[PDB]
Scaffold this active site. Sequence first.
Site: not given
Length: 190
Positions: A19, A124, A139
Amino acid sequence: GPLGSMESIFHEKQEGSLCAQHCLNNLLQGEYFSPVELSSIAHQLDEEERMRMAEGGVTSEDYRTFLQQPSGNMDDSGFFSIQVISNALKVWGLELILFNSPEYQRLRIDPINERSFICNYKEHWFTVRKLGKQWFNLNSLLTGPELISDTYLALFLAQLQQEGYSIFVVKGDLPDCEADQLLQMIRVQQ
């Protein structure tokens, strides 16, 4: 000079990739956080942010101001609420708030003026950290450290801003990481 920062741009020891908590760990310069906490932090945030804002009165404005953030509380399919980072940030010392806020921007709020920015795409979201003297996207969509020019970061946020609205300005005390070293501080020191 290390000759090349990108030579090893990223987070030192990383023990939690799934995550955003990962980018957070890198941003914080050190993990030390779990996914379970993120879920609890998010939940606690809703309860805390709800009570804190509700209690404090949230002057309503604070509500509409933050409300701008993405709702849904949080997921559990492999993603946590960006607000979780804020809760961790606050508890970490720094605070995380929405940037889109046209009130702050107008008052005199720049995207590059910050040190750490966050972007959210539909679902996202990604974490942007100012490495050295430039912004770097982190990311997974960037498939690595995507160097973002000062004139690009702002332009980028503007693009996303005009496209919708999902940017968080990280304000407070930001810890240094490996990137901080690549900026200048070289390993050699002892």
